[PDB]
């Protein structure tokens with residue numbers, strides 16, 4: 001193990017952000033080695049006094065050192081530090097205890113070949129791609145480095161959330177490319193593309209039973225997320241994907257948050273918030289919950305039965321907020337069955353407590369589908 005090159009080491013995390021480093025180091029003396037992207041130097045990061053401390057690994061004459069003896073490799077230096085329990089510096093008194101290994105999701109850049117751009121996300125371009133070992137087709141999310149540091153720190157959040165999930169109607173994570181820059185999140189490629197485009201393109205061809213089945217799939221995904229205490233915050237037709245077999249999967253988890261007690265209080269600082277899909281209390285007071293996702297689901301129902309129409313077309317975001325406060329809601333689409341519209345109206349109840357649960361939504365849609 002110690003003989004292996006640094007890049008192969010389990011405790012070498014390459015280009016992971018400082019914010020990810022803080023997540024990984026749990027106990028005193030927990031440590032990892034990484035490459036500092038800015039300075040192009042290796043860094044030993046260690047938890048001491050409750051906070052990560054970052055030591056620059058010096059290199060001279062092909063020997064790696066801190067303030068003591070030098071070694072011909074960084075793994076030999078780490079082994080010396082761990083085995084002797086010598087403080088990394090006399091001044092700091094930091095002593096290594098446990099090497100924090102990469103998880104199973106970390107992926108090498110070499111494993112992946114990037115293809116054509118397939119869309120644009122808030123963090124940057126999404127590309128199609130290929131895993132070289134088996135020809136598995138993937139979607140690859142990128143993060144533009146010119147984004148503000150506060151926001152870039154949020155990019156890996158979607159991967160951290162999705163690592164936990166497995167469901168037929170939730171997009172599947174494949175891995176995270178964080179050993180070098182540029183950083184990528186890698187997911188299964190969903191062949192049919194986004195649901196909004198599907199609705200607009202397939203259009204008059206789609207049967208009501210088919211639409212009910214697809215939104216039923218979305219309700220199943222949302223029920224599963226609610227069960228995991230996940231609040232998606234960006235549910236919309238454009239953020240649902242369609243498989244080659246017309247199964248719908250929820251995707252685009254960049255804004256999603258896990259809250260044990262069911263409420264996420266927004267920073268207030270979000271840019272490009274999808275105002276037309278967002279519940280009033282979430283905009284007004286920053287209160288996000290499964291109930292605010294339910295409001296979004298009502299908009300998704302509207303998008304589905306209007307075959308991809310844009311909501312509140314004649315209103316600005318601010319005008320939409322004012323319109324909704326006055327009791328305004330979207331009109332019933334022609335193709336929308338009366339029962340679906342009644343459910344849609346319940347989803348848009350002003351008080352979040354009055355809105356139906358995702359289980360109720362799934363069951364009601366399923367029951368409607370059986371008579372269509």
Ligand SMILES: C[C@@H]1CN(c2cccc(Nc3nc(N[C@@H]4CCCC[C@@H]4N)c(C#N)c4cn[nH]c(=O)c34)c2)C[C@H](C)O1
Pocket residue numbers: 118119120121126128139141171187188189190191192193194238239240241251252253
């Ligand atoms: C011509 C067709 C077009 N296709 C096509 C067209 C649109 C989207 C996608 N796919 C994905 N889009 C995502 N975000 C998009 C951002 C921009 C708006 C739409 C989406 N919201 C995400 C995310 N997060 C994912 C995540 N995981 N997996 C995916 O596939 C995926 C494929 C692929 C197909 C093979 O070629």
